[PDB]
Amino acid sequence: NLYFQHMKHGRVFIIKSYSEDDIHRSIKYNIWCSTEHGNKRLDAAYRSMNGKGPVYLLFSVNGSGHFCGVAEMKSAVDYNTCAGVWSQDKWKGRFDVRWIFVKDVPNSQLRHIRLENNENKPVTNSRDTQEVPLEKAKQVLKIIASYK
Ligand SMILES: COc1cc(=O)[nH]c(=O)[nH]1
DSSP: OOSSOOOOSOEEEEEEESOHHHHHHHHHHTEEOOOHHHHHHHHHHHHHHTTSSOEEEEEEETTSSEEEEEEEEOSOOBOSOOTTOSSSTTOOOBEEEEEEEEEEEEGGGTTTOEETTTTTEEGGGOOTTOEEOHHHHHHHHHHHHHOO
16 A cells, blocks of 8 residues: 555554544644543653654544544653643643544444454554554554545
8 A cells, every 4th residue: 555654663552532622623733632641651652762663643532433533643741731721621731743644434444453452352442542553553544544
């Protein structure tokens, strides 16, 4: 395929959101924020990457039945930022992202990809900041990229 053929390094995480408004804001301003635990997981992966490869994020709104696109993580986490900018006050902090695809892809197109690090559960059954093994992540990314 033409998409993601060169991604020898780097790491891929599921992002789950309770709020489609939060996603809209993320797309508009190219920023995101997770829980404290999820921020720490993404921060560790971004920093240990040391710019050697991409950290990609596969976004999905809880209950929507579809993934809604792909962004690249673009900064470390900043834990002390303006409160109350998201749909709930409980999302504290900020990191930069760069959205690559904004498009709805039905879970039917992805649910036969299983995560060997998550009890072989479908990737579509992941929780927020579930890490995706690199070879399964390539499959997901190419399906999203090419979907029509
Ligand atoms: C950044 O805004 C959100 C982050 C999250 O992890 N879940 C949400 O519903 N919104």
